Amino acid sequence: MWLTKLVLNPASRAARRDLANPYEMHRTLSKAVSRALEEGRERLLWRLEPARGLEPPVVLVQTLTEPDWSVLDEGYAQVFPPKPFHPALKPGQRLRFRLRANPAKRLKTPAEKVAWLERRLEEGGFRLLEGERGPWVQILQDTFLEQVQAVLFEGRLEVVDPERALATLRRGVGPGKALGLGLLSVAP
DSSP states (O other): OEEEEEEEOTTSHHHHHHHHOHHHHHHHHHGGGHHHHHTTOOOOEEEEOOOOTTSOOEEEEEESSOOOGGGSOTTSEEEOOOEEOOOOOOTTOEEEEEEEEOOSSOOOHHHHHHHHHHHHHHHTTEEEOEETTEESEEEEEEEEEOOEEEEEEEEEEEESOHHHHHHHHHHOSSSOTTTTOOOOEEEO
8 A cells, every 4th residue: 555645735726625525635636546546456545634723734645556646736735755555464463543434334323333333343354442431432523524424433453354454454444435534544
């Protein structure tokens, strides 16, 4: 995989348009890997990170092939050097995670949302860690994309099956992958 951190510049009208319409943002990001997507060798996943005041928004982008960000308009965003991402996963390995997702199969609710997450992670080869107060996860944001439900999960998990876990990172979790949902980000 390849991970690219983009710091969008709100001085750019196009950047603001994309920040306000996930569909448009996906269209712009797709340009960096258009041929790969055309040949079915790509799975573009991204996440508009939680906002910090009025500061420039950060968008984390994950692709299977090397992206060409020169396709972006000048001033659209500050492009940080894309980094190869090939995680070394092992059984029992504990990792912190972040995932903005649409809690459903296709495009107590708070407890149902966590329940949905548990099943998706287990099916994907991961497992939510258990704390003294239940599943190690919290809903940082519960909102709608323009209405598609978007839930931001953050917590701790462990790798159960390395191969399935890796496939899950490459594949994404849940629907709305073309709307900035589904990117499972992990870190020690």
